[PDB]
């Protein structure tokens, strides 16, 4: 029914023509999406990990391997406030039409979705964890290295991960950490590890995690599952927002302050093969 | 969801 | 109604047919313009910043945070003059008509706007201030680097932007400073930093500010919002001036000294998200 | 005969409409396929070589040349668990058989299968060799240099097969090895060998091997025939395996642990010219 | 009226159909239209310059800038003997008419005109200059460098224009200097600078002025204003000239020896911004 | 007579339709072909040469020319074996339809033809050179220089061929030689001689002679005459061939060891006009 | 009248369709033709020379323009007897046609004509002079340099003609000289004069005269007048030739020695300005 | 206004 | 088989 | 004059 | 033969 | 005419 034409619909369910564009804008910004692997889901589901192989009838022995099961779920709320200011009333939505409202929000809602998933996915910082983060797997299996940035330590980190079979892949390190990666040079073999032009640490690519969680550290992965799908939805109302903060004092009374907010309900889900390592600071 | 997973595989930093 | 035909219109608003040409020439010439992203506004616009911490039906008491509001205004007017003094009286322009005058005036007016805009907008010197500016934001947060042109200092400069989880995008170096930039080569990795052909410092485009408010300086930008509204709007002038100076000491008495000037009041607005770096010479 | 309408086809042979698409996906995935040719055949192919010499008419003085025949064969298999985990969704297959079934699983079975080929192709770690090519070709014709990374050594690496009347085509070097390729610069002629934009060593494209079986090595190729034949051949049983473990250790009793498994039996074949250069490392 | 048909009209003024072709030869041959600029003029135009202040209705400002007024004048002549070479008026001129005339001395007359423009334009050795010239601007504003053709000296030369907020565009240097341009081997980076195939120094096109007044040096140019106007005049008279030589010893009189002369006087003016650089050797 | 349709012709002559394709594949692969110039002939070619001098209507001094005539003939013949075996006996003939085999076997015979001819053309190997080879012309006029590969030594070779009024056109050097030249750099100016991307030595293009009759040898020619006039022919052989040998060291009886053999004869002629340069190794 | 038909025309004033291609081959091959300005005429021409100086419009005259009267004549003959031998009998001519002879004739007769002219044009060794030759001008205007090849000498050589007003324009030399031009390098300023890639001596372009007369010579050439108008003609007969010495020492009577001869006579002219320099060896 | 923003993205130094 | 041959020739890193 | 302007801008070494 | 001479002119290492 | 045109077009010194 809905397309362009009009917009005087406060509540509803978002049409899939505009949904997958919104998810397409979340796509690149989320670091765990780039590093992870994707297999399709509808609400609740179970999958099995790893890869299988044979050499035919020639050689029966060798090539032993493991299978493991896990169930996928959990919901993540999104409450918007910027929207309320840029558009006074719902007749203005109508004047734009149904299409352009979501095109205006296309960056805004997408920015906050990837921001929270990465904060609650790579670490357990926010209030939207559920299973086990990358940090949580490292809390189980003591894979800690002391705060020193040398060619031996990066090779040791990869070797430590390699020691339990699985080979290393892309790196997660914050933007401030990029400055320390510049000056890692050996005297005998005069070559720098970190390539400045193409963002890659030891050949493998890096992602600059825009968050205030890490300080001086490096993370790696390879084998990780992270596909999510349902429907975002839209609910427009004016109430006392609990998890937001007006100006700098107290909770935002919307009928008092005169805004028109919007909600997006998306689902968030993660499955991990539990063997990852972290490098952290020592101080003294 | 299939079309999402297809484009997700395409736009990935690590090559498959 | 008016197009070619004639030219006896003293006062008048320019049509959008001619507004895009004049602004197109302003876009390339101005340095701040080239770097910024221009969302549309009217007289004013209210923009909000920040995100929020959002869980799904659980919520623990943390991550309330701050939300910030901001609005923008103030204009940037400039004079044509040049055409007026070269080509005198209306009957002389009657042959040229409406279409001919704008094309011939095109580079003079466009050259004028950016010179004044950048002299007050980037460096806060020219007498047309509006709070929000590049040099003013550096007074709040000290991003100062000393006067030496080596790769490590440019790395350290970019590292200061990285400290507050922000990426480098472009550069601003003076035309006079272009000599010192090119003669910087590392001993180990024997490659030139500043490329002469493709104007870029660290694979990031440098833009040459013609204003004389710099010596040995480098400015950096990325997320930046300039805005524009309405029309250039022209008025023919045969009256006395206070602002301009006639060679020696007397003023531009247009009916006294037989000239025929032009007035062009353009409306341009600026907004800054903050965290912008700058290198300056120290010497002693 | 076969259509989209109906499923419940457990044991069967694929149509050429679907066999070519699934192969197309496996071609770009592979390393040996990207650096190799394709002669057609049915079961086994008889090949032969050499050019010979012949007189015009008279003398026939000192004319003596030889020629020898060759052979090619061998089959490879894989046992996927992933389609058996999907198997619960009977409505999927019943509603849209083949088209939607094989499209969903193009990575699921080809991704594992191509890595097995590369294990026995470029290395000999896999237990499905036939010609036992690259590893043994180095052992047969000792064309190895003591591993240090300089242009002189890269020229020497190419010189080994250039000496035996064979042109260099393309390189095989790790993603981790990419970092050491940047420091290659000669003292007299200040020019770079490896280009940042395109993964190529010289006028010669590089393929990055993901299988962790190289330290600091480079391999030249360009005289190989990779040959895929027959049909993938799908079987769908729900019974106990031999080469498998179910989570703890015990054999995956598929009736108890209610899954299914899809079998894929494609054909895999190679052939050699026995003139390849290999590099490794000096002391450590 | 005139086109082909006949030739007889001795005096007159050229048609625009035969003005543009002969003038095109001047432009392409000369080292000024190739490296300069153009506008139309009517007899002796007047130019006005410099940027005004203009406030934005807030405060008038304490900058206070000035306005500069300028002009251009003077024309050149040419009386060639080439028509005396092609004299035969009875037969040839009737067949040649008003079309083939100009085609036969299309290279000549234009040849003599283009050479003299640069002779009294780039240098000031001629006896028909009109003040504004490159050599004179260098005498006014000292930009003279004394040294060999080293990379740093070429950068220094260019930097003089950059020092007064002006960008370099192209180069003027003779073919004899090309030998010394070849040996510019840098200590770092690309070891070349000057491109051998395409005649360009720093990616800026070098123009080969083949004058007798240039020893071994480079001039930079990129801010000219050349102004051609008026269709050229032609005259046909067989007469005695005051100056000039008949053969070897004596004055050229027509009744003595039957020659025939052709005059072409093209009116042309110049202008400069008064900031152009020069390089020469060190006197020792 | 023939077209598509059928195939039961054991002996035969090729049509012009099929003759020029196989000859086209000979052209590009040959070294003497590309370097040398051409003309058509019949059975044999006789070309008459030399220059004269005369003023006209006068007799003066001396300097009368001399006459010399040159006739060229003979043929280089190349056998298959390989090609007959590919076709399955008379069954191919039963379903061939006079098209696909000349196309399938296009590069197999063409490769061997150039292989044998180049050995006879450039070197004096085999009993095929009835005329004078390049090596033989070097023995007549001693233009052999001894020394290691250095810039000046390569120019010295060209200088000596230039010494007798003849400009150097292009080099001939094998695949082993190509790899050796790369390390040659000029001391005075930091620039390289040999280029791999554009295969040329001293700005002169090179072709790799892939034969085992050279070590450190380079050859340059200006003029060269080669003739290819005739037809390839098509013959079957079920009987034994002396030139061909089986794997070990035996004559190979074709009735004994069930093979099929093809035989092709190309009427090719070669000729030189003396004065060719050469290089060779010293050892001791 | 003629076009193709079937030749049989022994005598013949050949048409301009086939003349101008044959003359074009003489032009490109000739070295004197590559450098000069060539006015047209029929049998003989009285014509004037030297470029016209500027009048100057406002300033009386200054430097005198200078004018001089000259004359032009003389014919050159050439017999391509071996080219006539190629076609044995009049029946063979019938199949060859009028048109075929000219295209196949074009290379040899053009070769002979340019070789004759340059030998009796630059030097005065060949005996078809017109007085005004380069060698004869050097005898009058003494411009001889001793056997020394250095940068200082080449500058001094150009300075000799510079002393008498004129500018050095271009060089004429042989291919043997290229070796001797390579060794010229100054130790203080390490740079070669002669460029190997682009054939230019001191920046000025060189042309290679392949004549066995000079040895260690550099010739300098500027403005030259010549004429190549006139129909070459084509006569062929079966008669004795006193010019063409056959085999050993005889007239070569055509009834005795059955051959066919062809004679072509092309009008040719040369003129000088009597200011040309020349270098020569001395030894002792 | 909207056309100016469209032109801006086309005539930017870095197109995005 | 036939399509395979053409794609193996086309869809490839090295191409002549 | 007007045609000259077009030719001057077109027939130039720098920027066409 | 004649076609070969034409292709020898076209398809060649050197062109004049 | 045509011969003079070819000479002008194919003179090496075209400065």
Numbering used by the authors:
A (entry chain F), C (entry chain G), D (entry chain E), E (entry chain B), F (entry chain D), G (entry chain C): 26 to 309
B (entry chain f), H (entry chain g), I (entry chain e), J (entry chain b), K (entry chain d): 191 to 206
L (entry chain c): 192 to 206
Task: Quote the study's own text.
There are seven CP subunits (A–G) in the asymmetric unit in the T = 7 80α procapsid structure, which are organized into A5 pentamers and BCDEFG hexamers. The 80α procapsid map had a density next to N-arm helix α1 that was identified as the 16 C-terminal residues of SP, which were built de novo as an 11-residue amphipathic α-helix followed by a 5-residue ‘hook’. The lower density of this feature is indicative of low occupancy, consistent with the previously estimated CP:SP molar ratio of 2:1. The hook includes the conserved RIIK motif that was previously hypothesized to interact with CP. The RIIK motif points into the hydrophobic cleft between the A and P domains, where R202, I203 and I204 make numerous contacts with the CP. In the preceding α-helix, L194, I197, A198 and K201 make contacts predominantly with the N-arm α-helix of CP. In subunits C and F only, residues Q192, R199 and N206 contact the adjacent CP subunits (B and E, respectively), presumably reflecting the hexamer skew that shifts these subunits relative to each other. In the 80α procapsid, the C-terminal 21 residues of SP form a ‘helix-and-hook’ motif that interacts extensively with the CP, especially with the N-arm. The rest of the SP was not resolved in the high-resolution map, suggesting that it is disordered and/or not organized with icosahedral symmetry. In the absence of CpmB, the less curved shell allows the incorporation of additional hexamers before requiring a pentamer, resulting in the T = 7 shell.
